[PDB]
Amino acid sequence: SLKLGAIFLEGITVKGVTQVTTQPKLGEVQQKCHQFCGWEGSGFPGAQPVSMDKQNIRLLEQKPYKVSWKADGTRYMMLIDGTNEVFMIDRDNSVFHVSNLEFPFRKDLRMHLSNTLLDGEMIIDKVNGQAVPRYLIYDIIKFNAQPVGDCDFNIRLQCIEREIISPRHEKMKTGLIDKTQEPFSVRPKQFFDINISRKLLEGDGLIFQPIGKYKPGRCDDILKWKPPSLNSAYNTAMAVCNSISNPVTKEMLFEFIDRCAA
Numbered sequence: 001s002l003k004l005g006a007i008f009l010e011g012i013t014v015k016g017v018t019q020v021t022t023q024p025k026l027g028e029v030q031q032k033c034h035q036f037c038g039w040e041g042s043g044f045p046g047a048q049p050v051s052m053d054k055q056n057i058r059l060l061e062q063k064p065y066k067v068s069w070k071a072d073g074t075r076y077m078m079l080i081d082g083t084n085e086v087f088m089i090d091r092d093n094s095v096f097h098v099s100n101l102e103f104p105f106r107k108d109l110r111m112h113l114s115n116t117l118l119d120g121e122m123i124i125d126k127v128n129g130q131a132v133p134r135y136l137i138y139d140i141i142k143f144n145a146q147p148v149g150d151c152d153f154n155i156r157l158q159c160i161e162r163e164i165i166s167p168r169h170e171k172m173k174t175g176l177i178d179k180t181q182e183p184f185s186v187r188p189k190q191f192f193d194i195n196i197s198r199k200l201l202e203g204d205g206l207i208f209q210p211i212g213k214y215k216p217g218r219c220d221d222i223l224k225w226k227p228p229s230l231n232s233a234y235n236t237a238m239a240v241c242n243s244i245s246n247p248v249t250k251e252m253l254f255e256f257i258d259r260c261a262a
């Protein structure tokens with residue numbers, strides 16, 4: 001099913017970012033995404049976290065995790081496959097084509113990456129007191145057709161910096177990649193050791209990612225945390241309702257992580 005009139009970012013208008021409705025390009029982009037994620041269904045192949053609760057919270061002492069700010073952005077998978085073949089995919093499976101957002105190859109800046117699929121969200125940051133869209137790279141499923149998604153989270157984060165972010169910065173500072181003519185900025189999401197979650201909540205929640213490998217669908221492994229208050233499908237919301245009866249206070253969390261901490 002197609003969604004006509006799809007919006008890339010409610011509010012701000014982004015030139016260079018237009019929804020793909022033409023075929024076969026639409027089915028090709030979607031198909032390629034599903035194959036990279038090894039998803040069989042038809043919906044969003046991307047990974048779906050689950051709200052933290054007094055039960056799965058124990059997973060933090062059972063294996064290595066990383067944490068980071070839980071922004072209020074729009075989820076989007078970015079399929080980078082060749083020059084002028086940069087596409088954004090949302091939860092509704094809508095596809096948007098992005099013009100002038102180049103992704104050079106680490107070894108040959110005149111080359112362009114392909115068979116690459118990033119995962120992250122779209123945010124509307126305020127710079128100099130003005131709306132400016134940014135894409136935060138959370139994960140990376142496939143790099144140049146390589147199953148980097150199967151690697152630990154550590155390696156995937158390095159791949160993004162080393163393979164995606166670094167090359168782009170090189171061509172901007174050396175070649176002709178004007179960050180002002182680009183549709184939006186591409187910055188990497190930053191993760192830290194969970195034994196410092198506290199520091200992140202002082203300056204809107206947290207998200208705990210395990211070192212395991214990328215997995216599409218529902219990941220009861222990935223825990224997103226949101227204050228008991230301001231805490232918003234039926235089955236999905238069902239885990240949000242019973243979560244209100246026995247909520248994980250910011251204290252319960254920190255205290256738990258401190259107990260676990262080495």
Ligand SMILES: Nc1nc2[nH]cnc2c(=O)[nH]1
Nearest residue numbers: 047049075119120121138
């Ligand atoms: N793992 C993961 N969690 C998210 N939470 C919001 N966006 C994302 C994402 O792209 N990946």
